[PDB]
Design a binder for this molecule. Structure first.
Ligand code: TPP
Ligand code: TPP
Ligand code: MG
Ligand code: MG
Lengths: 801, 801
């Protein structure tokens, strides 16, 4: 930690290149318009919300960047990737409006988007696909997402895919937000990878929402200490130009001492006082300091500003940042929250009008008018001249990539569609499908396999010799190894999954990890990924409650699919066979990176258990993609049931079908459900359409088109709700669902499958139970089966176990 | 960062207090038993799993701690809180067995616990309620958890609730694990809070699973750099005692330079070599360094040890940490991962027994026998004598607290059961309920309100003046303000929620935050909380997709209940009325902290929307707890339906009921469902039991004892699945569910409820559609309703919007 003063002394401060007066004129108009759209929205009294205080404290920081640093998307690259602080959006809208990119009607529709011509509260690409790029409102996600975006840009350059050398990634953060563990939890990575293309801009106004970050301390010093410790280049923008003279005359070094010794809370109090309270309480601390302002008017004292409000001090920091190589830079900008709002945190509106000399007359002020700059005006000319010199306007977004890829056909996955000689798993099938893709000329180098330390666990070691590990094992290595960092890996996956839009360069990521450490551990990023229109593959390996058998409670995943189904644009599958994995992966590739360019990402749970992999039934392709298909029918004269299974449990329901036929003469229709979720969604869509079209013939859910009315039983390696979600659409009178509800524990797969009551014997008992209720068989028949199969009818519900 | 040598010079370390020779015999027997345990498990060929290499590298560190530092639970406090590294559990089980706390059968049942007398793979209190205490296998969670546990202990002392001054929180971490953002993301608060009762002990063997953490770097230096920068006291345990002579006589300072410049990758290669290699490649780098070992034999050079394996160096570090005040201490212990195994890292184990001189011939080595110390033996006596001096054995856990609390009665919440004067929200109801508890002499001071910055948003700012904010706003403040740090707030919540077991001092936490940032953002911690048997309240404020209307996509929560239902021991509720909030909170209090001491925690979603709060219907209490009750029946001669709602949407379902009655002559039964999830679980439990007892009287789902068979419609502020989960148990032919599937966006509550097709008009159309389907009404009526209510039947599915 250094002295509590600017990192760059005036003598080392470059000359400011812009017209300060004209820029203030433009900046004031932007400030006014941002305040007007929020105030107009609030006038509606519809609890719309929207912030002003924050943007007021950081407007000049952004202004300097828009005028002299921010490079817009161009023919060569996607420009600078700016992670705009979420709640300062009204300022971004205000500027875009001034630039003529947004209309007054859209501003008047701030936070009212349902009808089409509105603006989102925050940066939401899904909602404004041609405007916003990075979802930053969920604090903490922006800093880490930006770190890996910067790393990914280096990756593209190192892999020879794209020269991203002219791009800088800017993460605009708040000091309070740095408390989120993901904000500083990964900063050493930027040092390890020498991310000199990443700039953290922390708005240090010393306050969070309900108070100061650390009133009894100095967060700017805490921030400097840890970022410096993490190897980052730290630039503190503490004081404005007015202080330069005071510090130079400060021969006793007492001013610096006073500055150093004052804590955040104190500084914050002076904030609400006056030029005399300051001189008395701040400067008045030491005669050496009090004597410095002795010859100063209380107004000249109160005129001393924080560095984050001085274009000159701001420019110096961003310039130094862009010059620095070898490591990332963090700019700690000292600002005043709710700057120039005084009374705030029509008299107040008149105050800011006067305060920033806004060109609005007394006659119009009540109309809460938006200000614009006429073509031909100095402000209009300058505003656009600065942007054009920087490649245009930002933020802006391109929803689809331009190139045409020559994707592998399903037949290219032919070997995976055949019966397998060796017993393998769906994970081995996944890796195999990856290899098929690695042979496709068009996308082979666009593939981005991602691992979080463990590769051997997922049988990925074989890929290393083929494509290598990115290690700028060299800068040309293709696989991203992020170590024990699921969030960081997800952020690399996200950068890769959105490269098609950001850099107009489609990249296809495949991140495989322990399924339990997916949505459960990085769920907020997964939701943000949906917002960012990520197109990629998330592979939840070692999935299923009873399949990762020895690991126990914090590893056994019987619910990730319940978490994944909450994301609208995530397509989830739980295949049982290798050929299903092939079909599913081929379809995803086609949908996401083929002509369709569907904004959806995939989640496929794969297993670590080997078993016989049969050949794909001819014509099963569509059913596999839709989520279900009849595997086969077993004859039985004494009854008929329908059996459903997915993942590693399907082969157990298949065994139950043979037992049912063999021991009870009960035949059955056996279905492989590759996706209970896609089926549920299809069912919901049909029922929704039916309800909205009362005069039309009811549409039939696909699952109802595939199944019949015979009593049905479903068993899965996930909690019952996974299969129970399609009940409404199952055309059978009876539908019994078996599942792995309850906490996992360590055992053999056999003991776990019996414990969670999802094995063959339970499926059989469940099937017999429905047939008995129908009078097709006697109840003593099921009571005997229960005894026969060594089933404890009275053991505690596994959910409670 | 400092030189790559021990922090404590030999001339500064204290005399080792223990019997080194006796201690190594005991340590060797533990190492043996740990390996035997894992080897016998693998022999079973059941894919059970289990690690050995990690505990081998940290064995000596734990040994010194067990012999001279770890305080077991005692009459005065819970002893030292040790977050044992998850995968080194076999070593903990090995010592426990040697202490006579575990049986051979139990060791023989390592990772086979489904039938009882077995051992969990990792620290899981839910599975081993009297042994383990803190779930640490999900890496990254142990470190944040520990920081907040230490802070909570300080809190108990400062609040005058318990003298926790004699307790130390030890977090045993892996160096690879430090890559998880949660690992270092919150270390600055240990400095902010001067947590000198916290010790992070990182095993620095330089390797994660599949490779070194930073092959071309120095993680120990990286670690030292950021922790030192964060204000922590860093103690490096680099080299064993054999290095002291070499470092002492090296007047040139070249050995340190060599040590400093050598990277992690090279140090690791040396480990796979021999003395000759080291002499040439390491010492041979410089003449001065070559000269230090020139008079040494290759064997003597090969014997040079890493500090973390030297009891004297280890002891010095822990003793010094014990003396450090004002801040937390990190011990960076340098170790060898595949430490004795060497070649490994049933007879090849004779190499391990040889090197550690284990008493067992190669004749009984294939039998993999366990080693025990007979009562009276020098080893047995020393083992127990050391533990007795430290108050006993650990880990150990007490499942229930001993004291009896005088909980508030439901009557105490009587004001909340009456009709409210003004329109309030369920969040205002929650705060009012908290106030009732705050008047209870028994639990008022055991309450732990927790917020993450935002308090005003949740109307919590009023308790700020009565009970204060913890700020060691003073050291007696009751409210924990954790800033913008949901994970941290969650860890404080967990520490509080488990104080009943850890310190035999029940504390009742109430953590309120934006519901979207609950399970979605800290879901892995929530799962671990269940594992840790947390008893507390999670309050998801500003919940419901359409109710936090202006916030949009990353804030509008219509799925947290779908995430919360995946946790076995989390009880979820979505109340609509203030009296329901009261009944639920009181019941939760009684269940968790009353004589029942139920191991469950609560999740209640509350709202920021004000509306009329009616009085509780007489006798509705049990129904509120169970999940559903009939609000009222509206008469109608033209038809009859059932209408269900929860949270903010219930009042719109009631409006629909009036419309149907008044405009269409359709009568109805209106139900408020406080918990669709609890109703679903009850139904699942009933059918499970039923099918398991086929000849017995069938149990009827609670929801089927409330609803009848008229066509039903349900609507809530959550995705359809939240209400559809009870389908199987609804005693009706038609059960139409409306929901908020799809990403959120900004608009008025009205516009959002129409967009998400969940408002009164949609409920009416859904109900009429069901009747038309039964011919009880013309389809034209439904079509005209759709027209009247301005419903766009061809609007895109909200899930896809
Ligand atoms: C994960 C998450 N938690 C909470 C919030 C709610 N929130 C909005 S603004 C705010 C405080 C902002 O403080 P800071 O990050 O210091 O930025 P400032 O507005 O002062 O520039 C909070 C907590 C959020 N957006 N995301
Ligand atoms: C969140 C999480 N991700 C992955 C794993 C799987 N895992 C088990 S051991 C291991 C590596 C451990 O390395 P380190 O933390 O350096 O400890 P060491 O075993 O070397 O002492 C990993 C990634 C886990 N337990 N938790
Ligand atoms: Mg701030
Ligand atoms: Mg390690």
């Amino acid at each position: 930690i250094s002295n509590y003063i600017n990192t760059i002394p005036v003598e080392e401060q470059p000359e400011y290149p812009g017209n300060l007066e004209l820029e203030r004129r433009i900046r004031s108009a932007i400030r006014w318009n941002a305040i007007m759209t929020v105030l107009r929205a609030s006038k509606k009294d519809l609890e719309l919300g929207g912030h002003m205080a924050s943007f007021q404290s950081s407007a000049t920081i952004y202004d300097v960047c828009f005028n002299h640093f921010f490079r817009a998307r161009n023919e060569q690259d996607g420009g600078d990737l700016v992670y705009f602080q979420g709640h300062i959006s009204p300022g971004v809208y205000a500027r875009a409006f001034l630039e003529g990119r947004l209309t007054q009607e859209q501003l008047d529709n701030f936070r009212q988007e349902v009808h089409g011509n509105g603006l989102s509260s925050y940066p939401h690409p899904k909602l404004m696909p041609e405007f916003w790029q990075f979802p930053t409102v969920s604090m903490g996600l922006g800093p880490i997402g930006a770190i890996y975006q910067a790393k990914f840009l280096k990756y593209l350059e190192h892999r020879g895919l794209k020269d991203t050398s002219k791009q800088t990634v800017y993460a605009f953060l708040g000091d309070g937000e740095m408390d989120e563990p993901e904000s500083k939890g990964a900063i050493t990575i930027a040092t390890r990878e020498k991310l000199d293309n990443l700039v953290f801009v922390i708005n240090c106004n010393l306050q969070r929402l309900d108070g100061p970050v650390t009133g009894n301390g100095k967060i700017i010093n805490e921030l400097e200490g840890i970022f410096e410790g993490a190897g980052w280049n730290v630039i503190k923008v503490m004081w404005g130009s007015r202080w330069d003279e005071l510090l130079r005359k400060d021969t006793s070094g007492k001013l610096i001492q006073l500055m150093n010794e004052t804590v955040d809370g104190d500084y914050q109090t002076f904030k609400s006082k006056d030029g005399a309270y300051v001189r008395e309480h701040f400067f008045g601390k030491y005669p050496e300091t009090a004597a410095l302002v002795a010859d100063w008017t209380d107004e000249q004292i109160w005129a001393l500003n924080r560095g984050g409000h001085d274009p000159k001090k701001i420019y110096a920091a961003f310039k130094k940042a862009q010059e620095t190589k070898g490591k990332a830079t963090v700019i700690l900008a000292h600002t005043i929250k709710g700057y120039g709002m005084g009374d705030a945190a029509m008299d107040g509106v008149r105050h800011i009008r006067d305060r920033f000399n806004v060109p609005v007359s007394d006659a119009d002020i009540e109309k809460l008018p938006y200000i614009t700059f006429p073509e031909g005006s100095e402000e209009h000319t300058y505003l656009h001249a600065q942007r054009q010199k920087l490649h245009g306007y930002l933020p802006s977004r391109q929803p689809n990539f331009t190139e045409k890829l020559e994707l592998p056909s399903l037949q290219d996955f032919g070997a995976l569609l055949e019966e397998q000689s060796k017993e393998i798993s769906t994970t081995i099938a996944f890796v195999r499908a990856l290899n098929v893709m690695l042979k496709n000329k068009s996308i082979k180098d666009r593939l981005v396999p991602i691992i979080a330390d463990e590769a051997r666990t997922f049988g990925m070691e074989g890929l290393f010799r083929q494509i290598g590990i990115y290690s700028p094992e060299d800068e040309k290595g293709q696989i991203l190894q992020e170590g024990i960092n699921e969030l960081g890996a997800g952020c690399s996956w996200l950068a890769a999954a959105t490269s098609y839009s950001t850099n107009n360069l489609p990249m296809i990521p495949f991140y495989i990890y322990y399924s339990m450490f997916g949505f459960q551990r990085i769920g907020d990023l997964c939701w943000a990924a949906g917002d960012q229109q990520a197109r990629g593959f998330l592979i939840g390996g070692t999935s299923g409650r009873t399949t990762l058998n020895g690991e126990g409670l914090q590893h056994e995943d019987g619910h990730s699919h319940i978490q994944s189904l909450t994301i609208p644009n995530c397509i989830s599958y739980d295949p049982a066979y290798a050929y299903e994995v092939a079909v599913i992966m081929h379809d995803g590739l086609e949908r996401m990176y083929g002509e369709k360019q569907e904004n959806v990402y995939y989640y496929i749970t794969t297993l670590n258990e080997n078993y016989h992999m049969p050949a794909m039934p001819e014509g099963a392709e569509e059913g596999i993609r839709k989520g279900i298909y009849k595997l086969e029918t077993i004859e039985g004269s004494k009854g008929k049931v329908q059996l459903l299974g997915s993942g590693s449990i399907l082969r157990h329901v298949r065994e139950a079908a043979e037992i049912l036929a063999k021991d009870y003469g009960v035949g059955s229709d056996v279905y492989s459900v590759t996706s209970f979720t896609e089926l549920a969604r299809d069912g919901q869509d049909c029922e929704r359409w039916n309800m909205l079209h009362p005069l039309e013939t009811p549409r039939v859910p696909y699952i109802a088109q595939v199944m019949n009315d015979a009593p049905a039983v479903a068993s899965t390696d996930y909690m019952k709700l996974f299969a129970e979600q399609v009940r409404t659409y199952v055309p059978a009178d009876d539908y019994r669902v078996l599942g792995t509800d309850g906490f996992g524990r360590s055992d053999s797969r056999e003991n776990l499958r019996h414990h969670f009551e999802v094995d063959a014997s339970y499926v059989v008992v469940a099937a017999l139970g429905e047939l008995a209720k129908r009078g097709e068989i006697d109840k003593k028949v099921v009571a005997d089966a229960i005894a026969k199969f060594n089933i404890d009818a009275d053991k505690v519900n596994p959910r409670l176990a």
